[PDB]
Design a protein around this nucleic acid. Sequence first.
RNA 1: GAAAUAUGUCUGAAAGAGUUACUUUGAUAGAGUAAAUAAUAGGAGCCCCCCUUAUUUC
Lengths: 255, 255, 255, 255, 211
Amino acid sequence: SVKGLVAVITGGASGLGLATAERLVGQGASAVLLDLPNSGGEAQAKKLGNNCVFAPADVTSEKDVQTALALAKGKFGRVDVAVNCAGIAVASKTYNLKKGQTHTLEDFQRVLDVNLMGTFNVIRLVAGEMGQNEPDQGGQRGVIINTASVAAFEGQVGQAAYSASKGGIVGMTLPIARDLAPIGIRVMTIAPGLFGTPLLTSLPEKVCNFLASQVPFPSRLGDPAEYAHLVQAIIENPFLNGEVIRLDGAIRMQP
Amino acid sequence: SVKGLVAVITGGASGLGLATAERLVGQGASAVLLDLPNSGGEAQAKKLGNNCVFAPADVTSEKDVQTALALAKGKFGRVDVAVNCAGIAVASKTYNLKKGQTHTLEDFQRVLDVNLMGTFNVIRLVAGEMGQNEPDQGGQRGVIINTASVAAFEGQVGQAAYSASKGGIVGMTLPIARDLAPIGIRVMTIAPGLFGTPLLTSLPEKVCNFLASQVPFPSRLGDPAEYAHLVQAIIENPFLNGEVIRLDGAIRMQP
Amino acid sequence: SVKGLVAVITGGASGLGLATAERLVGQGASAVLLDLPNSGGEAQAKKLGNNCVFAPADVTSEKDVQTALALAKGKFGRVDVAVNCAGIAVASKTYNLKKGQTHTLEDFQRVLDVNLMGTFNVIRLVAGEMGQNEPDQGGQRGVIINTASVAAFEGQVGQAAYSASKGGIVGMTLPIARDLAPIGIRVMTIAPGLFGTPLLTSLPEKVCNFLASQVPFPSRLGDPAEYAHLVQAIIENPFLNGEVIRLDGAIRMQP
Amino acid sequence: SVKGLVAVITGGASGLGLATAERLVGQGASAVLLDLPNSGGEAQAKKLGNNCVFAPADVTSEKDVQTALALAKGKFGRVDVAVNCAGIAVASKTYNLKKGQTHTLEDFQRVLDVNLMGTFNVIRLVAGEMGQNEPDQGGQRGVIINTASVAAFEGQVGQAAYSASKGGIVGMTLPIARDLAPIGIRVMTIAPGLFGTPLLTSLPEKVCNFLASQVPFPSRLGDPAEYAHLVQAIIENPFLNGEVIRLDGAIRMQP
Amino acid sequence: KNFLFLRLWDRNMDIAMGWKGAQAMQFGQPLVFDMAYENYMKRKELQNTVSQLLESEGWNRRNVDPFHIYFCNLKIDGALHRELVKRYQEKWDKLLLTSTEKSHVDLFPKDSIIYLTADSPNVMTTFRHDKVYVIGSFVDKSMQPGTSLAKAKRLNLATECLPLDKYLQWEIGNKNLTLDQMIRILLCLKNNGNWQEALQFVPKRKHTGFL
RNA sequence: GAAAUAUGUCUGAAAGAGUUACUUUGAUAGAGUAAAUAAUAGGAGCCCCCCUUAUUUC
Ligand SMILES: NC(=O)c1ccc[n+]([C@@H]2O[C@H](COP(=O)([O-])OP(=O)(O)OC[C@H]3O[C@@H](n4cnc5c(N)ncnc54)[C@H](O)[C@@H]3O)[C@@H](O)[C@H]2O)c1
Ligand SMILES: NC(=O)c1ccc[n+]([C@@H]2O[C@H](COP(=O)([O-])OP(=O)(O)OC[C@H]3O[C@@H](n4cnc5c(N)ncnc54)[C@H](O)[C@@H]3O)[C@@H](O)[C@H]2O)c1
Ligand SMILES: NC(=O)c1ccc[n+]([C@@H]2O[C@H](COP(=O)([O-])OP(=O)(O)OC[C@H]3O[C@@H](n4cnc5c(N)ncnc54)[C@H](O)[C@@H]3O)[C@@H](O)[C@H]2O)c1
Ligand SMILES: NC(=O)c1ccc[n+]([C@@H]2O[C@H](COP(=O)([O-])OP(=O)(O)OC[C@H]3O[C@@H](n4cnc5c(N)ncnc54)[C@H](O)[C@@H]3O)[C@@H](O)[C@H]2O)c1
Ligand SMILES: Nc1ncnc2c1ncn2[C@@H]1O[C@H](CSCC[C@H](N)C(=O)O)[C@@H](O)[C@H]1O
């Protein structure tokens, strides 16, 4: 039961974040879609109901995340859960000898800033709010669920920056799970595989169908509702901490 | 929910298996405890209710597991989940220079036979019995949940055979997740850390307090109810396949 | 340098073990090929020189390994390194619904006994033998190098038993490293990918060409000389311990 | 043999980079220390001989790395190895509820830019230089060896940013190993544990001595010569690719 | 029966305490034992002082959130250091505490130092997590009241005292407490413990009960 | 000018529970070897009263 828990979901206006917000609000929890101003997340917040609000913020900026967290605290009084689903994907080979093209450092920097720096910024700014809370029966003061990727374990070609950011999240899951262990904040990570959401619009449709056929079982793109289900299960279980869960369907990405 | 699902649980008369059976039966499922004849599991099955049955079996024996599966099919006509919680523990140093004592081969062989060979025997037989299930909406015919240990990753001194068996389970989780993917069966593994079951509670209270302090958070021995909750979450999520979940509370086993 | 070291190589009559023995003896070391009596290892031992001796032993038998180690001590006076390269493979699906065929338990048990149980038996007996060695300048009384497979991590369909055994070796690499750390024995594991050995050479040239194409780089089957080079590098480095090295050329075994 | 090669070593004026440069130059290869202008690497270049040169550059600045690589090409007309050892460490807790102190975002950005962004910048700017090389008889054009930490796998308290950067390096090791596989560049990562280099000057002396005593075997701070030896072994082995090697001594860190 | 772990719990406990102390040396809160009272103490007074320091550092070593104990002004050649070395033996170089000859004023801001002494008038309202607490290692058998204070005022440090009477019915007794008692009290206050729990380490003979 | 208690880990009539160091401990480590503790605030004559020391009742 997640009745009454307040969850701050970053990138909640689209894909996995929106699916998680939908499932959490549908079960009584509160939601604060911490998303970009132009993402059109206010419409999603209006659709979800009064329990859900929209915070226009860029996770790469400290001031925006602080404003969103202040809004969440004012509206609901607590931040009992955090979901870091805000990220971007860029496909670009490190170096293309035939075409003489070298990965632009700007793309790598932007991908890291949005994914890894953004996730750490949200974690560090929501840790304070979750630490001002009072421990429940068990000492817990909150839970943080990051969104890594299977690109952090078996990344494909032209996926170096994305894999770098997701591997950073995977690596820093445990150090942060030990920094906040005295407080009582659990920090988990989810490494989803191939999921059906706008992030895949860039990939060619034929490539997407082939990949969906390549998943051992179920041979389909993961439903975002399944990511939301795993997030809820992680929130409910008080003994899941400092761990990465591959929600990929047994797919291992070949070169 | 899990209403109407039939689960064959090995090691279900004690500890994690018993907790899993309790939760599944209380959620409306059916359970078939599969433990040794002298395990006192008949009392647990009687306590659980009519939905639960007990079959005296040895996971290391093909005939006994076959008879247990036949009993499950006769009683409920369907096997929809398998939970391989049946295992033993053995602590002994590979070699002690001071005492001039060498690890016995029989200890290693029996630890492998119970933890690893028995687990695979149950997996293959229950996969055979699950092929007869009509695929559900998603094409899934069953879910098999093994039970590795965090030792499999960072076993301590004197945990050579236990760690070997659990690492074997962890390694073979994915090969079997791909073997049975065409059938539609899902194979998952849970690697619990320190859990408050008869394996540790029988230790001196000072030892148990130390082990509890070892966990970063929650600073306590694991609750078997949490293992049952994770098992249910795996059962409910169709996109969780071929993965190992460390249910250990961020504890990295000390050297 | 590796001049003067005595190395007990299991399964050295053929394949990776033979390449390791060749390189070690060529560098000035001594070799004790510990393979099956009907393996042709006598001819290889004669070919290598007087420094190399063949001892017919079955790693799954404690008595045979004890006799082989006694012969090694008698011929060379000590054991300074051990290379567990003996093992077998089995191709068999966990369950094939179309054929109604289930994995035989005998195959799983046999693969376990040969690979994992054999490696552990050799490891423990070699630890006993090498404990008597006087510590060198760094305190090291020996080195033990196990052979795993990438099946331990990325296993393929119909590779349940092999993956289980290699995962067991990977799991027990660290517990044994901690067991033998006070003595001064270093335990390491090598996870080769695809290698041009009889385990793969006997296959038709079509599949061998396909596999050579699979490896991202070098786009060929692995050279056993490179496994021998890695083993020598592990022997020479005093600070490599309790670690698995994937010598596979960046290939991630597809389903 | 490594004679005649040219290696661009970033952060080669101190610690592991200097040890690697020393070993390579002593073995006969050339060396280009790509360290900060204020690092005092010119003295090291003079001390190493005429083979080694000092290239003042900042790995976080694209222009500086380009100029250093151009200088290396002009002096030696070839780049066969690129050793990314330039990095920094920061110890700061994610959140300190007791002191009410939260991790600064500038610290996280600094660590990321220096370690992860710097390593990727060097990799991408040296892949161009190594793509002009004529492939060897085996098809190899060069080797890029990154430096990571065991923090990438299990960081301790107050190690979130460093662990994030090292985990990013570990994650992107394989994607870049696959990007450059067509053009025959091997990308490998080394994950050292504790080593006796100036990076531990921040740590208290008693903390360093304790951590050293906590290495199973050898029970002492790692020797940079061992890191140089492993780098050489990676350079000499053509079948090592897309892999992370933990050169830590079996030490697993704790909170 | 079936055993999961070898019976090596004392080694494991000491190793875990070492790991926690190593973390505390980095991110813990300083606590100072000011070894500067060699002049006042006699032979037996110094023997206890060392014994109480041993017991106190043992209590803090086993805590859940250990302090970062500083042995400030610990003269190397003095009798304090000599007896500490004699008692600890090979462990003196492995202890995870900062033993320094520089006065605490040389290591921390003077605005973050509070010298705990009963002779101070100010009472310790709440245990602050951004301050340093100086516990002057001492045993006053031949009472010299106002010593620790006088020296605290000389160094120009703030002073405080535990609220012994505000939460206990002292009646008659020596208000000063043994170093181990003080460190246990401060470890109980540092872990969200109320004064009632914290002051339970006072000897029972010194007070009839709480208030 | 008279009266009081006054345990430097705690409890106390010797003793019990605690503290420190070393033992890689086969399930009683539920332990061994070695430090610390044997004038009850400091000293005296003989539990007994004597001055001093920190408190406290006219
Ligand atoms: N789509 C997949 O199958 C898949 C697989 C693995 C991992 N992931 C990761 O899961 C997460 C979910 O993404 P998705 O699949 O829903 O794609 P999406 O584009 O629908 O969701 C990404 C969200 O991030 C938001 N966002 C981006 N930058 C932001 C910023 N600076 N501040 C605030 N919000 C910002 C976007 O507005 C959007 O709402 C992403 O981090 C993605 O990288 C996705
Ligand atoms: N207890 C822990 O902290 C912990 C931690 C990690 C992993 N595990 C593993 O979790 C599993 C759950 O066991 P547990 O912790 O409840 O201990 P347990 O002894 O209470 O449960 C083991 C069960 O297995 C049964 N069993 C044993 N051998 C059998 C055999 N040959 N055939 C049939 N049944 C057999 C026993 O009768 C018992 O019911 C075990 O495999 C254990 O090793 C336990
Ligand atoms: N070939 C590969 O590419 C590859 C990949 C990953 C792992 N491996 C492992 O590498 C090892 C080397 O195999 P290989 O490729 O050299 O093939 P191989 O068949 O040449 O090596 C196996 C050797 O083990 C010996 N042997 C088998 N059972 C034995 C027993 N009971 N007692 C003693 N000796 C015994 C055989 O006689 C033979 O000499 C094996 O353990 C294999 O599983 C191989
Ligand atoms: N020291 C350890 O035990 C340890 C363990 C694991 C990993 N590492 C990693 O090993 C690497 C080597 O560090 P070390 O131990 O030799 O310490 P070090 O400080 O001696 O090495 C760092 C080097 O990088 C150079 N450098 C720093 N920032 C730079 C920049 N922006 N541009 C160019 N050069 C720059 C420094 O001048 C110095 O020469 C680091 O990346 C470190 O994170 C070290
Ligand atoms: N009631 C109390 N309030 C504050 N600190 C106290 C205390 N009792 C003991 N302490 C601490 O414990 C130490 C040993 S007590 C020695 C007291 C001596 N009169 C002096 O001049 O300090 C004292 O120095 C003080 O740091």
